[PDB]
Amino acid sequence: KRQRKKYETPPHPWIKERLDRERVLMDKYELKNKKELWKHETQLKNFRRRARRLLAARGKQAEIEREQLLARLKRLGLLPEDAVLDDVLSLTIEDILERRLQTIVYKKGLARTMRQARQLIVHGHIEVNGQIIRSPSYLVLKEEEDTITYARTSPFANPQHPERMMIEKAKQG
Amino acid sequence: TLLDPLANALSHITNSERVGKREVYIKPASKLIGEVLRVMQKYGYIGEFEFIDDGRAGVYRVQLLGRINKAGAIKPRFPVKVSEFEKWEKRFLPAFEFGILIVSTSQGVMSHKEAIEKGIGGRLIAYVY
């Protein structure tokens, strides 16, 4: 046995439609490589395959797996608390990308621009539930979402950090 | 030589439907054929069906309601368990629960849906949709 990549490369690299769509997603969300996007899309496809297999299965094990799948998806915040097994097929990549650490902190207004958010996360200025995490590609659970704050020892815990008032003004502006 | 009455009967039914004939006569009126004719009638594909005492093998008379896209006989009578239905059902029904398969089981020749409801395996004999 050898371990295997968790992401699936696209079947054809030079399709104009996919190229432009991925480019738009890249520019909006500003990932470093298409590798991250492909990893996220592979996660999406995994969830969709699980839903497909479960929808056609009868048995106690199928029910337990279905409940667990819905529980995890709700835990991620990707679905409402009254979600069913049908709408999961309607999930898109953008739902996942909205749940990214970088996307969440930027939506939490701690960065003027999400690239600056990526820098802050990398340099360890952003803590999750009091614990730091240096992967912007990390996926943030719903429960974690309210505990996202600046790292305590980092200067950004200081309200007077010169970049901090610019951050807060751009948030206000 | 007539190796099988059932497949011939179903082929005749389909060919009659396609042109649009009103009444169909099945020459080797076997018991299994009669049990078969009961099934899709119970599911409304056909109307009344009757037996005729011909003195050779009898003849089965049916009238066509124009509601049978295609009917045939799954020939090598594959034994199927309760869980393996969707495998064969994906092979012979155009869509999900579109049409019915017919299974010869311990409790008789009878519809695949009810067999799932009874949870009993058997041997596929024919398909129609």
Binding site: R48, R52, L55, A56, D86, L89, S90, T92 | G44, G66, R67, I68, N69, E86, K90, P94, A95, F96, E97, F98
Partner: protein, 227 residues
């Protein structure tokens, strides 16, 4: 919408009707597109259909599938001609295909557009998948087959958001028809895009042909025409 009615008003004010179908669409008697289809009438004035379906005039809803250059040889030159395979369809289950001959590309495109307008057909849509079963017209209601040339195309219902699993030509054809997901299986030469497009059109048209019981309509939420 309001723009579409505005164009309907313009083409009503201009187009004098000739055929028999023209008046009871210029007189307000007919209001549904499928009112043409149900009675088995015929269409030879494209101006009729856009009066009921102005959405054709959108640029996105009209596709050019192929441009081909056919060479009629002659004793004093290789006189060429453009054949345009085009498809015009709204995104609510009505679509048509056409082939236009032209001395120039532009005239070929115009004639192809008109012929695709005249070959408009209604469509059945549903959720026949063994997985989705959502009772919404995202896919075909059931497995169907179309044939043309050596091309045989079997469309099978596919789960929601799968994406059109078919070649690009069929991708465009099913895109303009208001259908979103499908499994495809092709046999023969798919390279000749004209025959492939015709086979897909045959499959979509055959979608109507199947006999249907009232229960399965509620089962699959079948939509015939406009969703």
């Amino acid at each position: 919408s309001q723009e579409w009615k505005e164009y309907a008003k313009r083409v009503l004010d201009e187009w004098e009707p000739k055929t028999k179908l023209g008046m009871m669409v210029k007189e307000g008697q007919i209001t549904d597109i499928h009112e043409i289809f149900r009675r088995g009438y015929q269409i030879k004035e494209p101006e009729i259909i856009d009066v009921l379906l102005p959405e054709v005039n959108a640029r996105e809803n009209q596709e050019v599938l192929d441009i081909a250059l056919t060479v009629r040889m002659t004793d004093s030159g290789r006189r060429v001609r453009f054949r345009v395979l085009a498809a015009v369809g709204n995104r609510d289950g009505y679509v048509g295909l056409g082939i236009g001959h032209g001395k120039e590309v532009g005239i070929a495109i115009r004639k192809a557009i008109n012929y695709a307008k005249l070959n408009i057909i209604e469509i059945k849509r549903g959720c026949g998948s063994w997985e989705c079963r959502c009772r919404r017209p995202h896919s075909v209601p059931f497995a169907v087959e179309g044939k043309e040339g050596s091309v045989r195309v079997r469309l099978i219902p596919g789960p929601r958001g799968l994406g059109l699993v078919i070649g690009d030509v069929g991708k465009k054809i099913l895109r303009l028809a208001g259908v979103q997901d499908v499994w495809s299986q092709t046999f023969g030469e798919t390279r000749t895009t004209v025959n492939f497009a015709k086979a897909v059109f045959n499959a979509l048209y055959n979608t109507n042909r199947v006999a249907i019981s009232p229960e399965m309509i509620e089962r699959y939420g079948i939509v015939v025409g406009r969703a």
